[PDB]
Design a binder for these strands. Structure first.
Length: 423
DNA sequence: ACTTATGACGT
DNA sequence: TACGTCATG
């Protein structure tokens, strides 16, 4: 029934904003955003506080337009180094959180602000120590139970939260709830503690989803935000999916989800239940069909990968429109700038994480191409040397220039290090 | 003129 | 390999 595992998805609420708010107290509890590259239209927003979201301010919005929506908005700019955005501060804060999470359970870093947590073993241990012990509501002070309450206090959201938690707990206590339900509940108690440790030790608040797999846990995470956690049980899946737009499910937010909607003639996740697996496999392929068939039933098997460390390290800069690189010197100079930041990051990785990158991947985008990458070429990464890496990167891609000039001018340079080896 | 990074799959 | 494409933060 896909109830074997307990899995959490933890997400740092507007993480870059929190990092800035911790460092500059004046920014706390105010409509706030983090921007990069202020010159063009105030710069683009990459993180927005909840106070600012109320005004309709979103990420990937220009700061000048954001100010139109929210006149009182406070802006924090990303550190700029070597002519590009420098995210070191956020990566460092990110590592702080992952270390704390690591003490409680097995974690998979999903991005800079999120991680999956496999709590199956952790739950098993707690159960033995806590045998025969009722689970107080006091253990779950920020937990919402999806689908509850069912059946004056309720007008307030905290009123709703309490009643749902009480019905849920009373039903476990009674013996009405299944064994996987108890596992999730203990998982949630563990996550409350993990979240309390994170805030105490970093000052950072975060939301979490708790469920039996990654898709459900990620879904649950978004249900009650910010600074709250949501338990989605197997039993809640039918009602939850019944009105749940397909594009909301992890991995269905793009072309596949669109074609599932377009080919099937449906809009909600639960509608997928009417199709046989073979029907779904014939439309979308063996793997996707199988995965769809199981997912609409709340079943998903992707494991939480024990991996706190990124598999690749990289940096990129965009040169949109008129700023597109059109000279040899410009291309070399920017490759150098990128290779310089890469070196610093690689060396830090080497001393901290006891591994070295062995392959250098160069990606570029040319003017007139919509695709994220127009071209990708690799070469050996023998020495963590910015001048060598930059020069090697040039060698592999120089043949791309059709015709001291460069054309078609590049709208993108990307350097990425891959294939890490223990040492 | 939404920028900057990652992880994973198909071939 | 792109080595290239998809999906997401």
């Amino acid at each position: 029934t896909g109830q074997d595992r307990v899995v959490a998805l933890v997400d740092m609420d507007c993480f870059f904003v929190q990092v800035e708010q911790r460092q500059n107290p004046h920014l706390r509890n105010k409509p706030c955003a983090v921007v990069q590259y202020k010159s063009w239209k105030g710069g683009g927003i990459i993180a927005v506080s909840y106070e600012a979201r109320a005004f309709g301010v979103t990420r990937s919005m220009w700061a000048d337009d954001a100010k139109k929506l929210c006149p009182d908005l406070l802006l924090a700019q990303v550190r700029e180094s070597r002519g590009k955005a420098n995210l070191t501060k956020y990566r460092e804060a990110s590592v702080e959180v992952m270390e704390i999470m690591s003490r409680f359970a097995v974690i998979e870093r999903a991005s800079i602000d999120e991680a999956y947590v496999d709590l199956t073993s952790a739950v098993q241990e707690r159960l033995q120590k806590l045998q025969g012990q009722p689970i107080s509501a006091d253990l779950l002070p920020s937990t919402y139970i999806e689908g509850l309450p069912q059946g004056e206090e309720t007008v307030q959201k905290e009123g709703m939260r309490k009643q749902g938690l009480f019905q849920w707990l009373d039903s476990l206590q009674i013996d009405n709830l299944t064994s996987p339900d108890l596992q999730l509940t203990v998982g949630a108690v563990i996550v409350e503690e993990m979240r309390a440790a994170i805030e105490r030790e970093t000052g950072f608040q975060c939301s979490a989803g708790i469920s039996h797999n990654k898709v459900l846990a990620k879904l649950a995470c978004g249900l009650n935000k910010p600074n709250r956690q949501t338990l989605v049980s197997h039993g809640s899946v039918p009602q939850l999916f019944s009105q749940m737009p397909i594009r909301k499910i992890r991995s269905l937010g793009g072309k596949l989800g669109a074609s599932v909607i377009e080919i099937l003639g449906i809009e909600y996740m639960g509608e997928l239940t009417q199709f046989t697996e073979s029907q779904l496999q014939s439309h979308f392929g063996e793997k996707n069909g199988s995965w769809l068939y199981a997912m609409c039933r709340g079943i998903e098997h992707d494991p939480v990968k024990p991996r706190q460390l990124p598999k690749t390290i990289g940096c990129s800069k965009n040169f949109p429109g008129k700023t597109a690189l059109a000279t040899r010197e410009q291309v070399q100079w920017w490759l150098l700038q990128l290779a310089q930041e890469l070196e610093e990051r690689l060396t830090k990785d080497r001393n901290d994480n006891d591994r070295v990158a062995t392959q250098l991947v160069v990606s570029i985008r040319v003017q007139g191409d919509k695709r994220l990458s127009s071209l990708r070429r690799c070469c050996a990464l023998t020495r963590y040397d910015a001048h060598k890496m930059s020069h090697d990167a040039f060698t592999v891609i120089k043949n791309c220039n059709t015709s001291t000039e460069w054309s078609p001018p590049l709208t993108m340079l990307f350097l990425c290090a891959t294939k890490f080896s223990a040492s």
